[PDB]
Design a protein around this nucleic acid. Structure first.
Lengths: 205, 173, 157, 159, 121
RNA sequence: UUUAUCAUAAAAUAUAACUUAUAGUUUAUGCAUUUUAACACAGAAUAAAUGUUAUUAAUUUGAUAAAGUGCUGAUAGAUUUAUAUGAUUACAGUGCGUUAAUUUUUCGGAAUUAUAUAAUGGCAUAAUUAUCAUUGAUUUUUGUGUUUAUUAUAUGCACUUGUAUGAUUAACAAUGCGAAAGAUUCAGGAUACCUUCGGGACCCGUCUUGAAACACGGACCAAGGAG
RNA sequence: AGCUGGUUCCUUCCGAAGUUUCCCUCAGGAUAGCUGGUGCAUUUUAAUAAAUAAUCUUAUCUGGUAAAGCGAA
RNA sequence: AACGCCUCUAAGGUCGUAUCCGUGCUGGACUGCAAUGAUAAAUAAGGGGCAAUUUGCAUUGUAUGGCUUCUAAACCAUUUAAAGUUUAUAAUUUACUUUAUAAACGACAAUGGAUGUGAUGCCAAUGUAAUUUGUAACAUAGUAAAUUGGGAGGAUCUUCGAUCACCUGAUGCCGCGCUAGUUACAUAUAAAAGCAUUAUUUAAUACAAUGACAAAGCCUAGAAUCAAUUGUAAACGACUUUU
């Protein structure tokens, strides 16, 4: 909320490339922009489904033999995979970096109060713009389930439930928006306090 | 890499007893007046001995593209050096510029063959009039009635907002 | 075209208001005959006016030489080197919070639970409109992603 | 082919990058994939080739004699009344608007915001009986239905 | 340095002097021909009558608080009111909003998402 | 190259009679209409569309070089013991008392023109000397004539918060405050040490090519203790 | 004891060598070379060059490597 | 398809390992997190609790010169680079879904801050402010303050799931506010000495949280651990049982 600019930027993880998004977000956290990233299952990473699957499998091979519980956390969730990507790009070994990680929140499948919130696009992160035509790409949530993410099934139901609440709110919003524009338009010409400011603005709104 | 075309002439030293060593010239593609001379000796050496500083430069002069708005097809004939493997090319480039053709050449040669700017030798320049363009890619441009689709676009990043709330929006209709 | 640039460059100075010279159009647009001499830019972000919303998010450093006597300051509205050049000269302040008073009468009397560190802006750091700043104290770097504040005093015309 | 934009002869292009910037131009000849010969004599950009990465292509297509030197382009452009269509063009009026969104010396800015609150009252004040939702009501009255007829007709009333 | 008046009666700014550097000089011009001009207001005029260190005279072992900023003086009021009146006549010609007449009152907005750099003030 | 214009080839891009089709539709498997990045340099013709020769345009266009021509912003610095035993001198402005004429403001004033001397460039002429080649140019030197412009000298004395005087920071101003002892307030500080942030810091002594070494002595401290 | 270990305050300025030769020498010396210090004599290389030192160039010598040769020894 | 063709491959697409990864199996994030219970101390006392509170007063953040701010409504649902955002007429649907006709922002410039998209702000304030403006008219557009009951609904690490809504009906009457436009009447702030006003650089106020001295306004009356005890447990703590 209260920020240098907005302390909460809800970012749509849909059609963002994973490292492109992670790097721009890392900058924003260091700048104090405190961002929340939602729908990390809709997050994409370039390189075929299969190519990603094998890349991600290579780390679980990495295992601290003596006590593997000291050893590398192979974070299943797409939200936590996003989180690992950002965390590596930040100096997380410093106390400054701890502050910056705390500024970051990462959710798969947009919950709580974030759904009546607008998911902002970061256009550098956009896969469709940056990625070349006819290049096969992976979706992170597909990759996640292969490496053992339990909750692929779970989020898909929770997302559908959310989409449905998000549908009814949209429908009423569009109905309301019609009736707001007519209520300006009909009073506008009928004296002049709307003719004065709109046409002295006269730009293109 | 700045592709400027230069006329360089060089005689081979000057004795009063010994008349008027013969005057050779070349067109040289160089960003540089010095690179114009530098290449000039190297190519001059290939026919006619003439080491600088038993070598006389003469005059270094830049030549004047005749038609830079002019819409012409050039064939350039080219020699390159590969690692085990020096070979010859003919390629044809559609450019404003004989300068622009060569600059697009060093880039293209660089790319495909791994084409060293030092490993490339120019050869010859002619402007192709008229259906002597072997050039399958080139001859597509010559075609009556040349209308062509704009394929795709290019998304300035983002915006004048780093924050683009108006979503690009790959659509465009 | 070097001549044409010279003729084109007379025109915006003419418009400013004055010294009274050249007109040779330039658009500000209806114009009777001009979409000619170009649509701005632009390159933004905001505040602006007590305070450019500014970020102390760094010190001017070598790769690993901290060099804090000058700081990098990102002015929000300045994308470009041109825009940040507007801010070259301006006085800066970082106002920040303290548990404990300190300072009694000279000007106002500040209850110094609110502390201010005063600085000036200098030259243009950024390819992307970050600016250098010197401060009289220098900012502790606990200020990082903290909002620092740049008043538009000293503005030249 | 629905029709995406053609790099065609005369499909026009408003070239962003240049000393041209924001001038409307017409494609003379198709050079190479990277470039097009472009001439906009009524927007007063002189004849040049320019890269298709510097210019992005318009909707507007006018039957053009493709290979035309400046004089015949200038003759074909005012025959098209191309400039006039380009002023109607509401997205170019929107492009002329960002040349006005520039400054509007701050005096003019609080015109908007003082007086926006004139309209901002009147919205909430017009609001609340269609069908949709429900919609209602049979108050509970003597001020509330006389406030609903205080849209409508507007005699006699309250309360 | 500059002589500045709001006009006083509108935007609460006195016959007040301020640095050339404090100021962004906006394109908006009020016809300055009607004025009595600060030929009459000189360095000395607003120079303070007086920060004595105390009760006029001469060494009376004094007391905490004279009037370093504040009475105010009648001569200074009269000077404002005449100048401001002529300001108001010229200033009323221009339409309401941020800063000439009822235009004057409002307190400036480069509103969030607005730009001190491309404001060609 | 390009504008503007002329001739020729020539319309090889487009325009242009007309010939044909799909198809919405229409008429009755086919037609007629029209639309079609679906037809045909298809006829004469047109825009010279491109090429070539000619002429050009505020002569373009590119490049490079040059004028303190005029000018703005920002940054850091500003030893100033200038008599410890060393300089303060130089110039400029302004006033003074030569005149006239024209012009501008139109008040106060200001400029340019009207002298002698010296130098310099530009014109013409002549000689030398070197040089590219002699059609004609360029060079170094010298003299002479003509006219013109430019610059310096003939511009002294008084006064001057004027410019510099070779590290020229101060006009001007505000504020704190030395307020007897007492003692407020302001500024400034990696003292010890605490805190908060960044960055850097591997264990010394030593032999050794190289020591943080998985090389060796040294737990820690005091005092004796060796060119 | 030619070996190992250690050798006790600081700052300023300059600043090495692991090479030569001989040695029962080869874990070391002497010796020459490199190093500093102390100065001395003269500065046209000095106090308010027509004398050089040593690097280019030039002019004048040398050489059996690279390359070449084997229908040259 | 490339290569008229043809072909497991270029694009797209199917099955497929004792593999891999889950299910499962094992430690259980020491305090990562959820749910729920009792929530004391007992009265000559008071203690805690709702305290989110409410008062003197205090602390701290916000905005910091009203405010020179701010925003948990909010541009889809996607294969995706001809991929595509829509409107309307004719049909169609639960679905900006599906079909035909006509257009349209033809990844242009536009657009990317704001349509502040339930049309925010910085407005209210007719003097907009480190005072608040107060008080008169006209005509147009036109505003609303309160309470209770009933029926159904919502909650993914979230600032009170014995909580907050919506709708529908009923009750009456404080008339508490009125706003914008134009226009009347009056005035404190504002004259912050200062001609250099930024410099040591403010706070009346506004909003949000926290506090608690004595006092004030509501509610409620636990257990844990040790001793002693079990053996299902064990080197000792601990575990499991106990009165």
């Amino acid at each position: 909320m209260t920020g240098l600019t907005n302390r909460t930027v809800v970012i749509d993880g849909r059609g963002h490339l994973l490292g492109r998004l992670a790097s721009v977000v890392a900058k924003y956290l260091l700048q104090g922009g405190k961002v929340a990233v939602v729908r990390c299952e809709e997050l994409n990473l370039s390189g075929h489904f299969y190519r990603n699957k094998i890349k991600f499998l290579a780390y679980l091979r990495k295992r601290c033999n003596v006590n593997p519980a000291r050893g590398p956390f192979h974070f299943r969730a797409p939200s936590r995979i996003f989180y690992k990507a950002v965390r590596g790009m930040i100096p997380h070994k410093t106390k400054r970096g701890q502050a910056a990680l705390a500024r970051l929140r990462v959710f798969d499948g947009i919950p709580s109060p974030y759904d009546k919130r607008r998911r902002v696009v970061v256009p550098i992160a956009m896969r469709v713009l940056t990625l070349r035509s006819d290049r096969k790409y992976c979706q992170v949530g597909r990759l996640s389930h292969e490496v053992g993410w339990h909750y692929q099934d779970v989020i898909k139901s929770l997302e559908r439930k959310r989409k449905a609440k998000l549908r009814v709110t949209l429908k009423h919003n569009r109905e309301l928006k019609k009736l707001t524009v007519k209520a300006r338009e009909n009073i506008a010409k009928a004296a002049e306090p709307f003719n004065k400011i709109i046409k002295s603005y006269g730009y293109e709104v | 890499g700045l592709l400027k075309e230069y006329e360089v002439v060089g005689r081979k030293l000057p004795s009063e007893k010994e008349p008027q060593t013969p005057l050779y010239k070349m067109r040289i593609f160089a960003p540089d007046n010095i690179v114009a001379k530098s290449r000039f000796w190297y190519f001059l050496r290939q026919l006619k001995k003439f080491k600088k500083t038993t070598g006389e430069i003469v005059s270094i002069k830049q030549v004047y593209e005749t038609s830079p708005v002019k819409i012409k097809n050039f064939g350039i004939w080219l020699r390159y050096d590969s690692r085990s493997g020096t070979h010859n090319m003919y390629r044809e480039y559609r450019d404003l510029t004989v300068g622009g053709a060569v600059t697009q050449c060093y880039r293209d040669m660089g790319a495909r063959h791994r084409a060293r700017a030092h490993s490339i030798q120019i050869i010859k320049v002619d402007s192709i009039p008229a259906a002597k363009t072997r050039r399958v890619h080139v001859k597509q441009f010559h075609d009556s009635k040349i209308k062509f689709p704009l394929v795709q676009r290019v998304h300035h990043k983002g915006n004048r907002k780093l924050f683009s709330f108006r979503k690009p929006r790959t659509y465009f209709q | 075209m070097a001549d044409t640039q010279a003729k084109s460059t007379t025109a915006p100075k003419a418009a400013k208001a004055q010294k009274a010279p050249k007109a040779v159009k330039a658009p500000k647009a209806e114009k009777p005959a001009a979409s000619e001499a170009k649509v701005s830019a632009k390159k933004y972000k905001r505040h602006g006016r007590l305070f450019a919303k500014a970020v102390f998010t760094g010190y001017k450093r070598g790769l690993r030489n901290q060099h804090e006597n000058q700081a990098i300051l990102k002015i929000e509205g300045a994308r470009r080197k041109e825009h940040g050049s507007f801010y070259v000269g301006k006085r800066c302040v970082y106002v920040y919070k303290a548990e404990t008073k300190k300072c009694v009468p000279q000007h106002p009397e500040r209850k110094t639970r609110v502390r201010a560190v005063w600085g000036k802006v200098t030259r243009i750091h950024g390819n992307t409109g970050a600016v250098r700043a010197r401060f009289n104290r220098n900012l502790p770097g606990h200020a990082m992603g903290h909002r620092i504040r740049i008043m538009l005093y000293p503005s030249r015309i | 082919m629905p029709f995406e934009r053609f790099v065609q002869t005369g499909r026009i292009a408003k070239a962003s990058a240049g000393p041209l910037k924001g001038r409307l131009v017409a494609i003379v000849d198709v050079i190479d994939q990277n470039r097009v010969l472009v001439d906009g004599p009524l927007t007063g950009v002189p004849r040049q080739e320019y890269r298709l990465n510097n210019l992005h292509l318009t909707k507007y297509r006018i039957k053009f004699p493709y290979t035309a030197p400046t004089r015949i382009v200038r003759k074909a452009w005012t025959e098209s009344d191309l400039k006039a269509q380009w002023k109607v063009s509401p997205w170019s009026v929107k492009a002329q608007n960002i040349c006005k969104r520039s400054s509007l010396n701050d005096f003019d800015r609080f015109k908007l915001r003082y007086a926006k609150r004139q309209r901002n009252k009147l919205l909430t004040i017009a609001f609340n009986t269609l069908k949709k939702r429900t919609k209602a009501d049979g108050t509970p009255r003597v001020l509330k239905k006389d406030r609903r007829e205080r849209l409508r007709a507007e005699k006699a009333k309250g309360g | 340095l500059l002589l500045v008046t709001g006009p006083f009666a509108l935007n609460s700014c006195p016959l007040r002097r301020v640095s050339q550097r404090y100021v962004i000089g906006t394109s908006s011009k009020v016809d300055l021909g009607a004025f009595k001009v600060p030929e009459h207001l000189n360095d000395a005029y607003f120079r303070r009558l007086k920060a004595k260190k105390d009760k006029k005279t001469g060494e009376a072992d004094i007391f905490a608080a004279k009037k370093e900023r504040f009475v105010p003086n009648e001569q200074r009021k009269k000077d404002q009111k005449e100048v401001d009146a002529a300001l108001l006549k010229v200033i009323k010609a221009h339409p309401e909003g941020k800063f000439f007449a009822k235009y004057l009152q409002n307190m400036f907005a480069l509103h969030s998402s607005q730009y001190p750099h491309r404001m060609r003030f």
